[PDB]
Amino acid sequence: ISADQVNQIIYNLHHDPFEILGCHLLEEGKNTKKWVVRAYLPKAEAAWVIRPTERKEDPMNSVHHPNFFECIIETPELNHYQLKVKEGEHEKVIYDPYAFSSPYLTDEDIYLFSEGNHHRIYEKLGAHVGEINGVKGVYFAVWAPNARNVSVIGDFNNWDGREHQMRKRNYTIWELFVPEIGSGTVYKYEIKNSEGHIYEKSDPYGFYREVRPNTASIVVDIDNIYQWHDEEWLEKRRNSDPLKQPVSVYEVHLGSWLHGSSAEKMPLLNGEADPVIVSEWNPGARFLSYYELAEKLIPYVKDMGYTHIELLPIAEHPFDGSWGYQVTGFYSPTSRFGRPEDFMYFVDKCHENGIGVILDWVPGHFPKDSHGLAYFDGTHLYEHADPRIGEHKEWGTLVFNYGRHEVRNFLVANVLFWFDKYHVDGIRVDAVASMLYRNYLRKEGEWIANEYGGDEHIEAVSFIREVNTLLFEYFPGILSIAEESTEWEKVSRPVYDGGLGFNLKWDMGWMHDMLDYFNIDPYFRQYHQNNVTFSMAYYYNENFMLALSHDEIVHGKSNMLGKMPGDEWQKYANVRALFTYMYTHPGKKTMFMSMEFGQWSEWNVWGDLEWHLLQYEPHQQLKQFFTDLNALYQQEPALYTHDFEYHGFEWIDCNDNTHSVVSFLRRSDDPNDSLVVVCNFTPQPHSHYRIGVPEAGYYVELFNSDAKQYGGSNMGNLGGKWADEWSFHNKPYSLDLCLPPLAVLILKLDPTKVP
Numbered sequence: 187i188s189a190d191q192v193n194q195i196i197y198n199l200h201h202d203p204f205e206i207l208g209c210h211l212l213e214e215g216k217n218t219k220k221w222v223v224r225a226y227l228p229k230a231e232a233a234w235v236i237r238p239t240e241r242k243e244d245p246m247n248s249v250h251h252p253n254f255f256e257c258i259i260e261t262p263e264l265n266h267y268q269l270k271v272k273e274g275e276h277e278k279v280i281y282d283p284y285a286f287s288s289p290y291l292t293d294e295d296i297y298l299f300s301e302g303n304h305h306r307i308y309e310k311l312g313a314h315v316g317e318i319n320g321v322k323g324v325y326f327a328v329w330a331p332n333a334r335n336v337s338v339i340g341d342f343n344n345w346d347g348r349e350h351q352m353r354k355r356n357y358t359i360w361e362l363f364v365p366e367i368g369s370g371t372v373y374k375y376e377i378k379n380s381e382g383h384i385y386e387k388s389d390p391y392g393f394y395r396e397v398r399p400n401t402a403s404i405v406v407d408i409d410n411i412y413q414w415h416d417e418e419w420l421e422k423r424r425n426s427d428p429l430k431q432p433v434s435v436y437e438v439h440l441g442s443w444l445h446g447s448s449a450e451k452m453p454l455l456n457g458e459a460d461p462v463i464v465s466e467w468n469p470g471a472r473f474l475s476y477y478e479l480a481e482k483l484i485p486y487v488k489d490m491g492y493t494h495i496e497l498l499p500i501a502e503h504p505f506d507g508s509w510g511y512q513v514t515g516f517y518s519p520t521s522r523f524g525r526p527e528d529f530m531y532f533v534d535k536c537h538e539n540g541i542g543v544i545l546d547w548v549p550g551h552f553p554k555d556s557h558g559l560a561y562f563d564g565t566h567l568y569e570h571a572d573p574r575i576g577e578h579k580e581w582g583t584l585v586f587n588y589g590r591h592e593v594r595n596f597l598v599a600n601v602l603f604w605f606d607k608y609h610v611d612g613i614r615v616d617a618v619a620s621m622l623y624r625n626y627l628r629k630e631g632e633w634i635a636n637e638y639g640g641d642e643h644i645e646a647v648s649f650i651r652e653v654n655t656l657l658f659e660y661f662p663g664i665l666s667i668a669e670e671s672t673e674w675e676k677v678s679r680p681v682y683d684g685g686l687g688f689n690l691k692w693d694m695g696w697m698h699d700m701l702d703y704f705n706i707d708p709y710f711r712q713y714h715q716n717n718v719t720f721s722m723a724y725y726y727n728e729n730f731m732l733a734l735s736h737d738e739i740v741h742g743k744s745n746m747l748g749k750m751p752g753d754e755w756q757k758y759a760n761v762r763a764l765f766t767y768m769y770t771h772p773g774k775k776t777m778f779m780s781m782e783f784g785q786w787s788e789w790n791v792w793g794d795l796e797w798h799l800l801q802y803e804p805h806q807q808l809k810q811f812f813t814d815l816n817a818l819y820q821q822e823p824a825l826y827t828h829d830f831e832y833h834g835f836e837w838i839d840c841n842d843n844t845h846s847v848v849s850f851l852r853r854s855d856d857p858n859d860s861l862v863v864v865c866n867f868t869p870q871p872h873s874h875y876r877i878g879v880p881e882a883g884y885y886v887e888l889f890n891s892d893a894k895q896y897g898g899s900n901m902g903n904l905g906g907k908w909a910d911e912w913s914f915h916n917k918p919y920s921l922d923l924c925l926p927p928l929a930v931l932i933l934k935l936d937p938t939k940v941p
């Protein structure tokens with residue numbers, strides 16, 4: 187480019203910067219093309235063009251001015267890229283601001299979507315504020331290839347679409363530009379199908395929606411509603427390996443954590459709205475907004491010391507009682523809690539406080555509600571037409587046709603959407619088996635095998651692999667977590683090794699082993715020592731997340747304290763021992779709201795948590811226990827650097843079943859960070875119990891779950907213990923410990939203690 191053109195950009199004299207900024211074709215070769223990407227990045231000293239899906243990165247060069255950049259790249263197609271931008275000592279990765287020069291669908295947009303590969307399709311499908319023919323308005327576009335007609339109905343035309351009939355492009359997508367309307371417009375699509383039947387649909391790509399049970403979509407100017415401040419968080423994420431860090435997740439259902447009063451408005455970020463009543467049977471209660479949750483949940487979690495919040499599904503869903511698992515508005519955070527910018531504020535505030543946000547994401551099915559995706563255009567569009575693979579009959583829901591390009595594209599682009607627009611730090615997928623098996627919850631003669639005679643759902647496996655390939659190319663540093671309950675192999679292994687590409691998997695066998703174990707009267711635990719130790723036999727086959735989830739404290743299963751045998755003291759003690767063991771056992775951690783303060787009742791999605799319990803000492807003490815344990819977890823490298831390597835763990839002795847005692851080491855890079863963990867899973871204290879340790883020296887009692895401040899009896903080793911030169915458990919030195927009842931000790935060598 188010339189200096190004259192650069193200066194026109196720098197000094198804001200250029201008539202249309204899209205002519206020169208962004209990606210432009212320079213020339214076509216026999217088997218490739220040559221492209222230039224240009225950027226004006228004021229205050230940046232350096233920039234690169236990332237082609238994440240090709241795993242390439244090319245420096246940009248300053249051209250005529252230090253903040254004007256260009257990059258020439260040869261490749262057959264340049265559809266997917268990001269800009270990495272360095273300003274002083276800091277780097278950010280963004281999409282190119284000049285990527286899309288028009289609001290309408292191009293030929294190229296249509297071709298990529300037809301192939302399933304438009305990773306940013308939600309920039310053009312749905313409703314977007316823009317300018318066409320010189321006039322500002324909203325562009326609508328919807329995929330409905332078999333419809334006879336589609337019209338936009340909304341507030342602006344009194345729900346009469348006769349003068350807002352859409353235009354069908356390429357036999358597949360309907361579009362319309364409507365001048366002089368903007369954000370806040372309420373609308374739906376009115377479709378006529380091939381039989382002439384007329385019906386109304388929410389926008390599949392809608393960004394905001396009325397409050398259930400109303401279903402109209404609402405136009406959002408999604409790139410001009412919120413200013414983020416989380417660049418430094420995002421940079422550290424992108425440059426870190428979360429597998430080598432502490433990951434302690436507080437799992438939360440936003441609708442049921444805490445309620446407010448329905449006698450006042452719901453406050454929003456700089457505004458307010460009418461209250462959303464929780465139910466007709468509890469009409470004095472309203473949900474808290476994303477804004478109020480930022481102000482209340484986030485400091486709560488920060489003070490408790492968790493690293494992450496994991497949300498049950500926040501995508502728009504019509505029925506509270508699904509918990510969010512039956513979604514009908516995949517591209518919008520639920521309007522129960524306010525507006526898109528309120529949830530952006532929530533995420534940005536998590537990041538400001540050094541807390542990550544993981545979303546439960548639900549690609550496995552969708553319910554039949556008539557406003558939603560079902561039978562969208564008068565055919566089986568999103569769902570497969572064959573009920574043997576397109577319906578989950580025991581659930582009453584429909585299964586996406588994962589092989590159909592535009593359906594795959596809806597979902598792949600949807601996962602990316604949440605990382606793009608809402609800056610989230612991970613996803614978790616529930617019931618992955620529901621996708622993976624063609625015979626899932628189906629009887630003989632009511633499913634059909636894949637093309638090779640097997641039960642593997644080939645199209646779903648392919649989709650899962652593509653989601654995880656893409657996610658980690660575009661957003662390295664994220665968490666992609668699976669719950670898969672059939673022993674499918676290599677869930678949390680790279681796709682290039684035959685894995686599904688997740689980076690963590692819930693250890694459901696561990697969860698069952700533990701909860702079953704702790705439910706056993708302690709005298710009987712000697713017949714079930716294997717529940718304590720067995721999960722280490724298969725542990726290195728996956729990267730495991732140790733999750734005690736919402737699903738374990740509903741349906742007659744009791745909350746944690748209720749599962750435990752004994753008197754009230756011992757129930758509490760069992761909880762502390764279990765969770766100290768969980769936090770010292772190799773793997774990342776997840777626990778659900780209410781578990782941290784000892785709620786007695788089961789989780790009820792229709793009310794809020796029993797916060798009044800925190801007026802009482804025993805619940806206070808258990809919450810202090812968790813606070814301290816999360817602090818310890820972040821402070822001790824041996825609890826998190828080598829979770830997934832042999833080096834990070836070794837049993838000292840796990841044979842004493844008769845006393846339900848086990849002990850082990852955790853290790854990190856520095857040998858002086860090694861930890862000795864000793865567990866006593868009966869209420870019998872031991873005044874002298876010998877444990878082998880690898881070095882001479884003084885072993886500080888770094889944590890003791892029977893401490894009085896946690897509600898325990900305060901038994902233990904008074905600060906720590908000198909090791910004896912007395913071989914034990916095949917180690918040269920040994921500690922003669924006092925083991926408190928129903929309790930876990932963590933000890934650590936202080937190699938500078940004065941003898």
Ligand SMILES: [Mg+2]
Pocket residue numbers: 345346347
């Ligand atoms: Mg009408």
Ligand SMILES: [Mg+2]
Pocket residue numbers: 617
């Ligand atoms: Mg399940």
Ligand SMILES: [Mg+2]
Pocket residue numbers: 714
């Ligand atoms: Mg058993």
Ligand SMILES: [Mg+2]
Pocket residue numbers: 793794795796
């Ligand atoms: Mg309540």
